Amino acid sequence: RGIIIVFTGNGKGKTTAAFGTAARAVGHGKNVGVVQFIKGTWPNGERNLLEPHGVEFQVMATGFTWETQNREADTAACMAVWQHGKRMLADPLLDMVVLDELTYMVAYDYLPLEEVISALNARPGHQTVIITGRGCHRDILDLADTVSELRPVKHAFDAGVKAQMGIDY
Amino acid sequence: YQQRQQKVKDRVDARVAQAQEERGIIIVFTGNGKGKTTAAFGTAARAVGHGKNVGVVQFIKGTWPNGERNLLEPHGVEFQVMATGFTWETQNREADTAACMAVWQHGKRMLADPLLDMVVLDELTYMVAYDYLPLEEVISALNARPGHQTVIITGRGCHRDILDLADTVSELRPVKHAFDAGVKAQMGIDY
Ligand code: B12
Numbered sequence: 001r002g003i004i005i006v007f008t009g010n011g012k013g014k015t016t017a018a019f020g021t022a023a024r025a026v027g028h029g030k031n032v033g034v035v036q037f038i039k040g041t042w043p044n045g046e047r048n049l050l051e052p053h054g055v056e057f058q059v060m061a062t063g064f065t066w067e068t069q070n071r072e073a074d075t076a077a078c079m080a081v082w083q084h085g086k087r088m089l090a091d092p093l094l095d096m097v098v099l100d101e102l103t104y105m106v107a108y109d110y111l112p113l114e115e116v117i118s119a120l121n122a123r124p125g126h127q128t129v130i131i132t133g134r135g136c137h138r139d140i141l142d143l144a145d146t147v148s149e150l151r152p153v154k155h156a157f158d159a160g161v162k163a164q165m166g167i168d169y
Numbered sequence: 170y171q172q173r174q175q176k177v178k179d180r181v182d183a184r185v186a187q188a189q190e191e192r193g194i195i196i197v198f199t200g201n202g203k204g205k206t207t208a209a210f211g212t213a214a215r216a217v218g219h220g221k222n223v224g225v226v227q228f229i230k231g232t233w234p235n236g237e238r239n240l241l242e243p244h245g246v247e248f249q250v251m252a253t254g255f256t257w258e259t260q261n262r263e264a265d266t267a268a269c270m271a272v273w274q275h276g277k278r279m280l281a282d283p284l285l286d287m288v289v290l291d292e293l294t295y296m297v298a299y300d301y302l303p304l305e306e307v308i309s310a311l312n313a314r315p316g317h318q319t320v321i322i323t324g325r326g327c328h329r330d331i332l333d334l335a336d337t338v339s340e341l342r343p344v345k346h347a348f349d350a351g352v353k354a355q356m357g358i359d360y
């Protein structure tokens with residue numbers, strides 16, 4: 001059976017765990033679909049690597065909400081990208097769907113919670129969903145089969161190390 | 170609103186102006202929750218997607234089918250994996266120790282190779298915890314590695330000295346796991 005996995009918490013490794021699992025599925029010939037919220041204005045190494053293997057990526061591509069500073073524009077992009085999420089979540093030819101940084105869309109009221117719950121509950125029985133992001137709604141956590149919270153024991157950004165291509169994005 | 174957001178931006182930008190070192194870092198993925206190995210390989214995939222060079226040592230045998238390795242290896246990611254005979258048994262401890270020391274020679278090579286942007290040392294923590302691999306060899310290799318190389322170490326129960334040495338540590342807490350609900354290991358998910 002397909003399960004729902006959540007990678008949450010403030011430490012590094014949520015999105016990279018989701019995409020390491022996608023890499024794992026692609027390496028066994030499974031089909032993966034990907035939707036990424038907020039993200040898209042920076043280079044994306046995981047997309048560079050996986051898209052040529054037939055992993056469809058749909059990204060919101062608006063950027064940080066504290067840069068865009070435009071709730072309505074962000075909400076419109078969230079909903080448009082979500083239309084891709086709902087298609088994937090309805091596609092029995094996909095073994096796995098990644099919904100990366102979905103947490104914030106619910107937390108900021110961009111994306112109604114009920115739409116997320118019913119799409120997850122209507123999905124094909126064999127399909128696994130990986131949701132990531134800080135600050136995951138309790139009801140998504142309750143619905144999930146596996147939840148790992150990445151505790152931020154230490155992060156190199158605190159010690160003054162800049163984000164670098166190939167590590168941080 | 171614009172004003173509330175602007176205060177966020179201002180704090181993010183100030184944190185950003187303060188952190189200007191560019192160097193290789195040590196990342197450790199530890200904890201009992203699922204996600205350590207897969208984050209390590211999501212990171213390797215991210216790195217390969219930007220043309221970086223990755224080497225991998227896995228301190229467990231490669232008898233199960235290995236999706237990440239199936240994908241990454243044809244991209245020129247070198248895998249070294251522990252000998253197939255490894256037992257974990259007290260009776261075979263001398264052979265198991267030698268098997269661990271042997272892939273570790275490849276790990277030392279990688280960690281001295283300036284052409285490798287990233288080295289993954291997957292399940293290394295057990296080798297030091299169970300006395301197959303001396304702590305001092307790991308600490309010295311990591312300190313002598315190339316200035317621009319990142320290393321990713323994974324596994325439950327990581328030695329305190331490797332944790333002190335790391336730049337970034339995430340502990341994966343097993344809030345829930347489908348195993349406890351009777352969901353069995355599946356290809357593509359658990360291996
Ligand atoms: C920690 C852990 C590991 C550690 C063990 C390190 C150690 N020496 O302590 C490492 C990372 C090495 C490991 C590797 C693997 N494991 Co494991 N492991 C676990 C986990 C999370 C806890 C084990 C534990 O605490 N044991 C408690 C007591 C019983 O400990 P112990 O028996 O003395 O420890 C030994 C066993 O755990 C054994 N073991 C661990 N995994 C496996 C897998 C198989 C096939 C066998 C025969 C034995 C075995 O390794 C130790 C040897 O000293 C369990 C799930 C769970 N919550 O129980 C999965 C679990 C045992 N692992 C599993 C799997 C699938 C794997 C890997 C295939 C993962 C992968 N993608 O590579 C490999 C298999 C290695 C092989 N046989 O070729 C599955 C086994 C499914 C099955 N059909 O039996 C489990 C049940 C996870 C799941 N299904 O969700 N594992």
Ligand SMILES: Nc1ncnc2c1ncn2[C@@H]1O[C@H](COP(=O)(O)OP(=O)(O)OP(=O)(O)O)[C@@H](O)[C@H]1O
Binds near residue numbers: 010158163
């Ligand atoms: N605690 C933190 N401090 C500073 N930077 C962080 C922290 N956690 C994650 N990052 C980095 O900040 C950006 C936003 O990603 P996010 O906050 O979703 O974490 P993640 O998904 O756990 O990180 P990754 O994508 O590397 O696995 C990324 O470049 C990420 O590596």
Ligand SMILES: Nc1ncnc2c1ncn2[C@@H]1O[C@H](COP(=O)(O)OP(=O)(O)OP(=O)(O)O)[C@@H](O)[C@H]1O
Binds near residue numbers: 325354
């Ligand atoms: N808390 C847990 N309960 C049950 N199974 C687990 C747990 N954590 C990891 N696993 C699964 O047990 C095996 C051993 O994994 P390990 O302890 O190395 O964790 P991991 O590296 O975090 O897992 P993955 O490779 O899935 O990221 C893998 O099949 C893994 O998916």
Ligand SMILES: [Mg+2]
Binds near residue numbers: 014016101133
């Ligand atoms: Mg993320």
Ligand SMILES: [Mg+2]
Binds near residue numbers: 205207292
């Ligand atoms: Mg592992």
